[PDB]
């Protein structure tokens, strides 16, 4: 006798155990410059929100932007979605930051952090894309909404299509949400183009997504699909698309 029901033997891999979670900037400068575990780049939603006006003056700093800037975009077009991952968490909740502190989304003036959102975005899904859809979604009312949504942002501008399409729809199931997230950036920076049921949407994503999200979505998303599927190439599919999440040169924080 035993139950081996009662071990969560579908949670896989487990290299850091749950740890319950309770005025310098150069060493974010730093993780800037170098890929290292998430582990090694982590912060806490609270110590960002006490150093905003000092990573503010970093990130909208003209002293080296053009190049972190790049090298931002040259990581995420080679990078998967674990590096991808990493960046829409780190511009999440960024913006989430400098809008609680009475900034907004005007182009005018660059941020590092910022500035690079709609690349980001485009290359996640891109990546996402990679994923036997088929296999992963199910439903096929939710699978076809999700697919139509990669369609536009992968291929084109069309970003505002897929906000639009997105704030029509229920997003009560997980993959759609997680690409909703994925937009919310994208989608207030494109805030007077697109339909007002999507300005709220994402607006309220915005206001409402906590640092661990993304990364938590795609992960049980991706966690539960492969506790059934048997399926040898929709496996192979999922690894190529989430590479190494050492990969991410460009990154300065991992938030939590
Ligand atoms: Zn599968």
């Known amino acids: 006798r035993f139950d081996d029901s009662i071990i969560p033997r579908h949670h896989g891999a487990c290299f850091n155990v749950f740890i319950p979670?309770?005025?310098?900037?150069?060493?974010?400068?730093?993780?800037?410059?170098?890929?290292?575990?998430?582990?090694?780049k982590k912060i806490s939603a609270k110590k960002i929100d006490h150093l905003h006006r000092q990573m503010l003056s970093?990130?909208?700093?003209?002293?080296?932007?053009?190049?972190?800037?790049?090298?931002?975009?040259?990581?995420?077009?080679?990078?998967?979605?674990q590096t991808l991952g990493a960046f829409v968490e780190e511009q999440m909740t960024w913006a989430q930051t400098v809008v609680r502190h009475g900034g907004?989304?005007?182009?005018?003036?660059?941020?590092?952090?910022?500035?690079?959102?709609?690349?980001?975005?485009?290359?996640?899904?891109?990546?996402?894309?990679?994923?036997?859809?088929?296999?992963?979604?199910?439903?096929?009312?939710?699978?076809?909404?999700?697919?139509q949504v990669a369609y536009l942002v992968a291929m084109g501008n069309?970003?505002?299509?897929?906000?639009?399409?997105?704030?029509?729809?229920?997003?009560?199931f997980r993959g759609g949400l997680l690409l909703a997230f994925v937009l919310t950036i994208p989608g207030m920076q494109s805030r007077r183009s697109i339909s007002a049921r999507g300005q709220e949407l994402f607006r309220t994503l915005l206001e409402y997504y906590r640092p661990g999200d993304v990364m938590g979505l795609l992960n049980v998303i991706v966690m539960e699909h492969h506790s059934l599927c048997r399926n040898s190439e929709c496996a192979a599919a999922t690894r190529a698309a989430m590479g190494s999440a050492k990969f991410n040169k460009g990154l300065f924080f991992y938030p939590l």
């Open 21 to 40: 979670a309770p005025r310098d900037i150069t060493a974010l400068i730093r993780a800037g410059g170098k890929d290292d575990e998430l582990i090694n």
């Open 58 to 81: 970093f990130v909208t700093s003209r002293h080296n932007q053009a190049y972190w800037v790049s090298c931002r975009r040259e990581t995420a077009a080679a990078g998967g979605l």
């Open 104 to 147: 907004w989304f005007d182009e005018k003036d660059i941020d590092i952090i910022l500035d690079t959102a709609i690349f980001v975005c485009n290359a996640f899904v891109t990546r996402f894309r990679l994923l036997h859809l088929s296999c992963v979604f199910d439903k096929q009312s939710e699978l076809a909404l999700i697919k």
């Open 158 to 172: 069309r970003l505002v299509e897929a906000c639009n399409l997105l704030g029509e729809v229920k997003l009560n």
